[PDB]
Amino acid sequence: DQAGITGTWYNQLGSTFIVTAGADGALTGTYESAVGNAESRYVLTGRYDSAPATDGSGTALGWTVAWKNNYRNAHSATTWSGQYVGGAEARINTQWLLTYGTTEANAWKSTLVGHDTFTKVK
Amino acid sequence: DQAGITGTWYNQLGSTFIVTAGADGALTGTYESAVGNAESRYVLTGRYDSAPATDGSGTALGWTVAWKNNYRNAHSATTWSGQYVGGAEARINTQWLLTYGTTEANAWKSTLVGHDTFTKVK
Amino acid sequence: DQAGITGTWYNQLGSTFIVTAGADGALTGTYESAVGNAESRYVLTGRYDSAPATDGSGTALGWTVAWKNNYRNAHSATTWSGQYVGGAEARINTQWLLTYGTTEANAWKSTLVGHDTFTKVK
Amino acid sequence: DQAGITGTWYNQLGSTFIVTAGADGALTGTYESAVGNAESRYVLTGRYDSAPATDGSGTALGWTVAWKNNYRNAHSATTWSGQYVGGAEARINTQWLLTYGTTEANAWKSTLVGHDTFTKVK
Ligand code: NA
DSSP, rough: HHHHSEEEETTOOOOOEEEEEOOTTTEEEEOOOOOOOOSEEEEEEEEEOOOOOSSSSHHHHEEEEEESSSOOOOEEEEEEEEEEOOOOOEEEEEEEEEEEEOOOOGGGOOOEEEEEEEOOOO | OHHSSSSSEEEETOOEEHHHHHTTTTEEEEEESSOOOOOOOOOEEEEEEEEOOOOOOOEEEEEEEESSSSOOOHHHHEEEEEEEETTTTTTTEEEEEEOOOOGGGGGGGOOOEEEEESOOOO | OOOHHHHEEETSSSEEEEEEEETSEEEEEEOOOSSSOSSSSSEEEEEEOSSSSSSSEEEEEEEEEEEEESEEEEEEEEEEEEEESSSSEEEEEEEEEEEEEEOOGGGGGGGEEEEEEEEEEO | HHHHHHHEOOTTTTOEEEEOTTTTTTEEEEESSSSSSSSSEEEEEEEEEOOOOOSSSOOOEEEEEESSSSOOOOEEEEHHHHHHEOOOOEEEEEEEEEEOOOGGGGGGOOEEEEEEEEOOOO
């Protein structure tokens, strides 16, 4: 599925996820968010199951973006956890956690949760 | 917080998180889980905010493990999203998502959520 | 939105959510899951913001089902947290946590997370 | 566990959860938050597994609060999902989702996630 995963993906918000899957299970690339306090590309890294089950289960993967680049620093980081589902309309189905740096007093509201679905087209 | 983050951490379950924080915002290391379908070390990668706010906010970070190594494949991946809090008893406070690859019929129950707190001692 | 909310809703799995919104902010009804260790109807209760913002924001709400009725006991409970969005195709957009009763040794994997979208038609 | 659950609990933030567990699996009571845009008591309702497993598993439960009372309206709702653990130091261990009413353009950041642990003392 390294072939399957490698490439450019778009989520329902119009964000762009550019990724390369290595044969060793690495994920590397860039992320551009259509929303939030964000501009241009941000480095991402992650991991995926490079020897998935052959029973038509999806392929588990996840990755992280820290929302700091040369343009902006949102003092936050998102991780997406999900699975790649192959076939005619390939999808990465995710849930994500966004944590922003807070004081201890604000720690209770430090983390957003959502869900993003990525496809190969817009 | 490069120095602050780099090192060996343990969570409340007795899992071991060995990480290096690069100056470019990279996290690299290994993870050993005291629980689940897991043995020995697994590669992790992630990102952290390499220029955090100076108002006493934590430092946002996240990382991923795909639960495949030379011993086992759990066909799953966990992402931790959280913040590093410096000082006498330093902490990484996280929330995590564990997605396991499923059929589309089992997709609704593909994801676990939890929270791990990491300290520099057991 | 009392009127808007009250009635029969269906999610993307084919589950059926039958609810009455009281004027005091109460939600009462039954839930039938198309998936999992579930048969027939289960009691639900919840709350909703009975005086929402008038700026086009959704209406916050949540509810709980404990997965025990006269047929089955899954020893678990789901809460849905989300918002009701009015207009031509009304939606309830949710995220949910499902916790199942565990031993302390299995507590780390006690909780599932997902997202359900409910509409007035199947 | 009806007697077990019924009563006053406190979480790690100093919030106060006052609950009655009915024989039919109902949870009714009030919640006061030590944090956020909250004052005084708010109605809660929820459900719990009134016939738990006898193998030393916890008891599943959940409840909702809509953050509207006679003082304030935060246009939001939290659901807690978790389990009651009996014994010398009884605990309710939860994860929670807080959704606030948003426009469709801000839906992606409408939901916070956390974890609260409740005990019988502060
Ligand atoms: Na509820």
